[PDB]
Amino acid sequence: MGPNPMKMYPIEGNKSVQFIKPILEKLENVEVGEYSYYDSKNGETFDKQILYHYPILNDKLKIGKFCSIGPGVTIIMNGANHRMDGSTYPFNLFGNGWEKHMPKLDQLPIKGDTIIGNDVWIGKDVVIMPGVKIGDGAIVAANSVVVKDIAPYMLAGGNPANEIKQRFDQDTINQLLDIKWWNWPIDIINENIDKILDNSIIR
Amino acid sequence: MGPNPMKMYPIEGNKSVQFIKPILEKLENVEVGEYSYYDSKNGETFDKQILYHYPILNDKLKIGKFCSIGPGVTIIMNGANHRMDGSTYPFNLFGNGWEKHMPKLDQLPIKGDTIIGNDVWIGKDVVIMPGVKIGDGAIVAANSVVVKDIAPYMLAGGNPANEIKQRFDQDTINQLLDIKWWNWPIDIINENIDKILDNSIIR
Amino acid sequence: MGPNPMKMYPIEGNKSVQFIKPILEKLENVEVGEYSYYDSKNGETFDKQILYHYPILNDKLKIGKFCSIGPGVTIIMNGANHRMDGSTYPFNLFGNGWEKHMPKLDQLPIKGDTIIGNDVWIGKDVVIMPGVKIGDGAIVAANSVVVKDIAPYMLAGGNPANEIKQRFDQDTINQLLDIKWWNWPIDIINENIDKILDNSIIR
Ligand SMILES: Cc1cc(C(=O)N/N=C\c2cc(Cl)cc(Cl)c2O)c2cc(Br)ccc2n1
Ligand SMILES: Cc1cc(C(=O)N/N=C\c2cc(Cl)cc(Cl)c2O)c2cc(Br)ccc2n1
Ligand SMILES: Cc1cc(C(=O)N/N=C\c2cc(Cl)cc(Cl)c2O)c2cc(Br)ccc2n1
């Protein structure tokens, strides 16, 4: 039947392998699919890897199901954005009168929501920058800095990350995107893991 | 009027936000402008972020005023350069007779001084390599590795960093570079911060 | 006659500078040349910097002689590769019945061996990804992520790392590749260090 997606540590006695959804459920403006996991670098929990995510800015983080998130991956939300229609210097931060120059919410750049799809593998130490969408089945190389969208079933890498090549032929990608195995009843997934693992699920 | 730029920790209760000028006061061959700050990640002080800066090589670091330096930024001076007209292997390091092959001063590459302008925002974890000049008003993306110069009021990013686009039109940039608001006494700046923040200062 | 290549710490009183060969000699499927050294970041030993190297995968790591490996360099062997003929999701990791879906050895991607040549300088915090070959006399810039081969006597840099330019003219490179000074008797090396350092060995 497989592991329990509501355990933060699905494997008894193992504090490195973590299910993301139950860890992040307390968080506003975050949605995470079942079974998506974090492979911890030093025992740290995955909530510590999500940076500058402030409810006031109303940006959303969404992660699909069956993702593999490598150790040290960080997700950067919009909270560190500076005002930039003029000086980026945050006079307001320093007070003694300068707090009158606090930016209005509509003066702060918002890059958008961050959306990671289903069955996505994010390599070790990748930085996901604000407003990025990563398509189902993508693979992001270790140490990438993702600043723009990545299409489904692409291998991508670098800083700035770029799409390197499609993982499979277009027909295969099309069929995978249509069938969406990640959305099947879990008992049906279980019956078909071998075929999900070798792509024969589309045959 | 804002805080005193000579105060190491200008935000009350906060021992992470640091004015860099008073933090770096003890260091030779370092010139730093007022109001420029370091957004410490863990309370570490910005002097620990300046690497391989050795008086004998006589390279200089200069940082302008009103810069925003994100957490983890490192500035690499010339002290880790290897000799490269032949083997890069530093035989001299090992002593035991090999110290006679110490490079003479004019045998070591010096990439130049490092000069960061005024009103520059440098994102989290950026690495500034030896000899680079970054123009007034530039913005460097988080996780960039800056190996060549960045022109004024450019957005730049990547590893190696490249200019992405101009922040403002050329005429606006030209006017900002003429007016140099950062050089005004703070009691004059204080009367104009809103115009500095929205670029109408040029009018 | 120079330092002792069998000392882990060849410099008395110094626990940072390390000779790599004696440290790694205990390791299966690793070969390292004499005098190649690691410039430790926090006192960590260089064995800690070789990641995911498992004898069962039978990938090999080779490093030549007289290499300079900067602080924080990591070498990534093949052991963290996900199966990717279909889903990259490691169902088997989680037990609870999914353990039956363990990948066969022949289902795990193998990028190849990692081979670093002689007289190679790898800069601070470089990541060497699986399967990469780096030719004799190459220089890899700090913070590079090396994903493909680097030719001999190339300057290379970036993420992904690309060749920037040849260090010397082609004839000089070919002469150095023929001479192989790193393979000379140690007494002959000692007689000629200044010429190895200024490249006049080619004459
Ligand atoms: C065997 C193989 C080949 C590749 C592959 O063909 N990579 N090609 C180029 C490449 C480019 C970057 Cl910017 C980074 C990495 Cl690690 C690459 O391998 C691969 C790519 C990712 Br992304 C993840 C796993 C991979 N495995
Ligand atoms: C809304 C916005 C857009 C941009 C923008 O148009 N970025 N364009 C590309 C881009 C390129 C890299 Cl190499 C890295 C990042 Cl983070 C980018 O956003 C932006 C760039 C930086 Br530098 C800093 C803040 C920014 N904010
Ligand atoms: C004086 C000098 C110039 C160079 C040089 O001409 N570099 N050119 C470009 C460059 C490109 C990347 Cl992607 C990274 C760095 Cl640090 C570079 O210097 C140099 C390059 C490496 Br690699 C190592 C040491 C170097 N030293």
For chain A, give the DSSP string. Answer: ----TT-SS-STT-SSEEEHHHHHTTSTTEEE-TT-EEE-SSS--GGGGEES--GGG---EEE-SS-EE-TT-EEE-GGGPPP-SS----GGGG-TTGGGGPPPGGGS-----EEE-SS-EE-TT-EE-TT-EE-TT-EE-TT-EE-S-B-TTEEEEETTEEEEEESS-HHHHHHHHHH-GGGS-HHHHHHTHHHHHHTGGG-
3-class SS at C4? coil
Query: CB neighbours of B175 closer than 8 A, spacing ≥ 6?
Result: B202
CB distance A54 to A103 below 8 Å: no
Could you tell me how far CA C72 lies from the centroid of its own chain? Answer: 12
Query: CB neighbours of A30 closer than 8 A, spacing ≥ 6?
Result: A24, A50, A53, A60, A61, A62
Between the alpha carbon of residue B26 and those of residues B15, B21, B29, B30, B76, the distances in Å are: 19, 10, 10, 9, 18
Residue-wise burial string across A116-138, b where 16 or more C-beta atoms lie within 10 A, e elsewhere = bbbbbbbbbbbbbbbbbbbbbbb
Query: CB neighbours of A54 closer than 8 A, spacing ≥ 6?
Result: A77, A78, A79
3-class SS at C145? strand
3-class SS at B87? coil
**Backbone φ, ψ for residue C62 (5° rounding):** -125, 135
Going through B102-160 in order, the beta strands assigned E by DSSP cover 114-116, 121-122, 127-128, 133-134, 139-140, 145-146, 154-158
| Residue spans of alpha helices (H) in chain C | 20-24, 170-179, 186-191, 193-198
Residue (of A37, A190, A167) closest to C90 by Cα position: A37
- In angstroms, the CA B15 to CA B11 distance is 8
Could you tell me how far CA B53 lies from the centroid of its own chain? Answer: 13
Could you tell me how far CA C114 lies from the centroid of its own chain? Answer: 7
Fill in the amino acid letter for A25: E
- In angstroms, the CA A28 to CA A51 distance is 14
Residue B2: its H or E element = none
CATH classification at residue C104: 2.160.10.10
CB distance C18 to C73 below 8 Å: no
Task: End-to-end CA distance of chain A: give it in Å, rounded.
Answer: 24
Pocket of ligand 2 contains residue A129 by CB under 6 Å:
yes
Contact between chains at C91 and A197 (C-beta distance less than 8 A): yes
Fill in the amino acid letter for C28: E
- In angstroms, the CA B80 to CA B159 distance is 19
Ligand 1 center from residue A141 Cα (angstroms): 6
Query: CB neighbours of B17 closer than 8 A, spacing ≥ 6?
Result: A93, B9, B10, B11, B37, B38, B39, B40
Query: CB neighbours of A61 closer than 8 A, spacing ≥ 6?
Result: A29, A30, A31, A50, A53, A75, A77, A113, A114
Query: How wide is the angle at C-alpha C118 spanned by C-alphas C114 and C119, nearest 5°?
Result: 125
- In angstroms, the CA B21 to CA C166 distance is 41
CB distance C198 to B83 below 8 Å: no
Domain containing residue C139? 1-203
Neighbours of B188 (CB within 10 A): 10
Which tokens belong to A29? 């403006």
Q: Choosing from B82, B101, B148, B195, which is the catalytic residue?
A: B82
CB distance B158 to B144 below 8 Å: yes
CB distance B40 to B69 below 8 Å: no
Query: How wide is the angle at C-alpha C122 spanned by C-alphas C117 and C125, nearest 5°?
Result: 140
Query: How wide is the angle at C-alpha B184 spanned by C-alphas B183 and B187, nearest 5°?
Result: 140
Please report where in the chains the tokens 């409810």 appear, as a residue: A55
β-bridge mates for residue A200, sequence order? none
- In angstroms, the CA B27 to CA B47 distance is 8
Sign of CA dihedral B147, B153, B157, B163: negative
Residues of C with Cβ-Cβ distance to A141 under 8 angstroms: 129, 145, 147
Residue (of A91, A54, A95) closest to A76 by Cα position: A54
Which tokens belong to B179? 């007016």
**Bond prior to B130 in cis (omega within 30° of 0):** no
- In angstroms, the CA B108 to CA C105 distance is 49
β-bridge mates for residue C145, sequence order? C127
Which tokens belong to B133? 């000049």
Contact between chains at A197 and C83 (C-beta distance less than 8 A): yes
Helices (H) and strands (E) counted in chain B, each on its own, are 4, 15
CB distance A128 to A115 below 8 Å: no
User: How many residues does the structure list for chain C?
Assistant: 203
CB distance A114 to A129 below 8 Å: no
Fill in the amino acid letter for B102: M
- In angstroms, the CA A172 to CA C60 distance is 34
Q: How far is A47 from chain C (nearest CA, A)?
A: 21
Which tokens belong to A157? 């890498």
- In angstroms, the CA A98 to CA C186 distance is 67
User: Please, is B127 exposed, middle or buried when counting C-beta atoms within 10 Å of its C-beta (0-12, 13-18, 19+)?
Assistant: buried
Residue B178: its H or E element = helix B170-179
- In angstroms, the CA A7 to CA A9 distance is 5
Query: What method was applied to determine this entry?
Result: X-ray
Which tokens belong to B163? 């200019």
- For a pocket test of ligand 2, which of B73, B127, B155 has the largest count of ligand atoms closer than 8 A to its C-beta? B155
Ligand 3 center from residue B117 Cα (angstroms): 22
- In angstroms, the CA A13 to CA C165 distance is 51
Residue (of B44, B35, B26, B88) closest to B65 by Cα position: B35
Neighbours of B157 (CB within 10 A): 25
Which tokens belong to C191? 């007689």
Which tokens belong to A153? 């079933």
Pocket of ligand 2 contains residue B201 by CB under 6 Å:
no
Could you tell me how far CA A22 lies from the centroid of its own chain? Answer: 15
CB distance A110 to A125 below 8 Å: no
- In angstroms, the CA C67 to CA C115 distance is 12
Query: How wide is the angle at C-alpha B99 spanned by C-alphas B93 and B100, nearest 5°?
Result: 145
3-class SS at C15? coil
Residue (of A84, A87, A151) closest to A115 by Cα position: A151
Residue (of B118, B181, B16, B193) closest to A98 by Cα position: B193
- Partners for A (CB, 8 Å, 3+ pairs)? B, C
Q: How far is B65 from chain C (nearest CA, A)?
A: 28
Between the alpha carbon of residue C10 and those of residues A147, B87, B100, C37, C183, the distances in Å are: 44, 20, 17, 10, 21
Which tokens belong to A87? 């000086």
Residues of A with Cβ-Cβ distance to C76 under 8 angstroms: 142
Provide the 8-state DSSP code for B83.
P
User: Please, is A178 exposed, middle or buried when counting C-beta atoms within 10 Å of its C-beta (0-12, 13-18, 19+)?
Assistant: exposed
Neighbours of A101 (CB within 10 A): 18
**Backbone φ, ψ for residue A79 (5° rounding):** -70, -15
Provide the 8-state DSSP code for B122.
E
User: How many residues does the structure list for chain B?
Assistant: 203
Query: How wide is the angle at C-alpha A23 spanned by C-alphas A22 and A27, nearest 5°?
Result: 100
- For a pocket test of ligand 2, which of B124, B143, B164, B166 has the largest count of ligand atoms closer than 8 A to its C-beta? B164
User: Please, is C133 exposed, middle or buried when counting C-beta atoms within 10 Å of its C-beta (0-12, 13-18, 19+)?
Assistant: middle
Residues of A with Cβ-Cβ distance to B10 under 8 angstroms: 94
CB distance A81 to A130 below 8 Å: yes
Please report where in the chains the tokens 């686009």 appear, as a residue: B165
Query: CB neighbours of B173 closer than 8 A, spacing ≥ 6?
Result: B137, B152, B153, B166, B167
- In angstroms, the CA C43 to CA C121 distance is 20
Contact between chains at A66 and C84 (C-beta distance less than 8 A): no
CB distance C59 to C28 below 8 Å: no
CB distance C52 to C84 below 8 Å: no
CB distance C62 to A106 below 8 Å: no
Question: For chain B, what is the domain count?
Answer: 1
CB distance C176 to C136 below 8 Å: yes
Strand B145-146: give its sheet, edge to edge.
Answer: B50-51, B74-76, B127-128, B145-146
Comparing CB atoms, the residue among C1, C157, C201 nearest residue B160 is C157
Ligand 3 center from residue B49 Cα (angstroms): 21
| Secondary structure of C52-85 as H, E, C letters | CCCHHHCCCEEECCCCEECCCCEEECHHHCCCCC
Please report where in the chains the tokens 């890069």 appear, as a residue: B88
Which tokens belong to C78? 């093949």
- In angstroms, the CA C19 to CA B93 distance is 12
Residue C99: its H or E element = none
Q: Whose CA is closest to atom 2 on ligand 1?
A: C111
